[PDB]
């Protein structure tokens, strides 16, 4: 059995690497220096932002993240297909699982690109500071803060990509998502993912007491970030009527 669970962990890590071009390991090598990777150009004010790119600031940056989210949903969707059992589920439920799982996964993986000071951008080529994001115009200045506050706590667990691979899989296969037709097949997959995760954390973090429990508890903070994020999008759509929002992102948010 436990040999089977190591095989699952290995499968998931493999697909993760295949699906997500900027891993936590690459992110950390960029963020902390040095030699395997290269140093980011740092955006920290209106000056550096102009010198950095080679209509207005906050909205343009907002469209930037909006476009990254779309790529992220594309990568996540590719990864979900690799989770054993996922593609065999009722198609409606595949859609439901992705619809609800995707943003919880975006914020988990976004934490890999973050430290307390800011976030990696343009595939690790850039680094935008938390302060600069926080200084942005009235509604946009609030978008990233909750993600930074999560990242700081989440990053304290010291998870690596092989851990995150299984964790993200656990998130996607939640049998407690609204409007799931066949809850049981989903729960049977998740049960196995949870077993695999537990063994993986035991093995990878032997000195780390109750890391499994401490990680599942983080799923609480993920839910709150989603709620807050979609509230701000409501504000943006009514205040910026000329603002375009990607169809993929359109039908994900609609009917939380």
Ligand X SMILES: COc1ccc(C(=O)n2c(C)c(Cc3cccc(O[C@@H](C)C(=O)O)c3)c3cc(OC(F)(F)F)ccc32)cc1
Q: Which residues are annotated as a binding site for rosiglitazone?
A: 66-69, 103, 229, 253
Binding residues vs a copy of itself (CB under 8 A): 153, 174, 176, 190-191, 194-195, 198, 209-210, 212-214, 216-217, 219-224, 227
Closer CB to a copy of itself, residue 224 or residue 239?
Answer: 224
> H/E/C letters for each residue in 188-226?
HHHHHHHHHHHHHHHHHCCCCCCHHHHHHHHHHHHHHHH
Stretch of 120-128, 201-209, 212-220, 247-255 lying at the interface with ligand X (CB under 6 A)? 120-128
Instruction: Tell me the closest approach of the beta carbon of residue 2 to ligand X, in angstroms.
Output: 29
Binding residue for ligand X, selected from 9, 12, 97, 110, defined by CB under 6 A: 110
Closer CB to ligand X, residue 31 or residue 121?
Answer: 121
Q: Under a CB-based contact definition with an 8 Å cutoff, are residues 21 and 123 in contact? A: yes
Quote the DSSP letter at residue 88: G
Position 109 contacts ligand X (CB under 6 A): yes
Return the residues of window 141-180 that contact ligand X according to CB under 6 A. 147
CA distance 144 to 4: 39
**Residues comprising the chain, all counted:** 256
Q: Coil, strand or helix: which one is 19?
A: helix
CA distance 97 to 80: 9
- The binding site for ligand X (CB under 6 A) comprises 20, 61, 64-65, 68-69, 72, 75-76, 105-107, 109-110, 113, 119-122, 128, 147, 229
């Amino acid at each position: 059995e436990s040999a089977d669970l190591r095989a699952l962990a290995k499968h998931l890590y493999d697909s993760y690497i295949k699906s997500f071009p900027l891993t936590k390991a690459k992110a950390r090598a960029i963020l902390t220096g040095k030699t395997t990777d290269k140093s980011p150009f740092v955006i920290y004010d209106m000056n550096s932002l102009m010198m950095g790119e080679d209509k207005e600031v906050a909205i343009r940056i907002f469209q930037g993240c909006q476009f990254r989210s779309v790529e992220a949903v594309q990568e996540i969707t590719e990864y979900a297909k690799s989770i054993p059992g996922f593609v065999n589920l009722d198609l409606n439920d595949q859609v439901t699982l992705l619809k609800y799982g995707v943003h919880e996964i975006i914020y988990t993986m976004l934490a890999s690109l973050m430290n307390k000071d800011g976030v990696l951008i343009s595939e690790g080529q850039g680094f935008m500071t938390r302060e600069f994001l926080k200084s942005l115009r009235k509604p946009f200045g609030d978008f990233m803060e909750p993600k930074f506050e999560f990242a700081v706590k989440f990053n304290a667990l010291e998870l690596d990509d092989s851990d995150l691979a299984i964790f993200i899989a656990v998130i996607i296969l939640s049998g407690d998502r609204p409007g799931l037709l066949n809850v049981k097949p989903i729960e049977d997959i998740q049960d196995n993912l949870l077993q695999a995760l537990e063994l993986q954390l035991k093995l990878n973090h032997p000195e780390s007491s109750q890391l499994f429990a401490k990680l599942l508890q983080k799923m609480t903070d993920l839910r709150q970030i989603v709620t807050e994020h979609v509230q701000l999008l409501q504000v943006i759509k009514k205040t910026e009527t000329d603002m375009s929002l990607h169809p993929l992102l359109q039908e994900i948010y609609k009917d939380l």
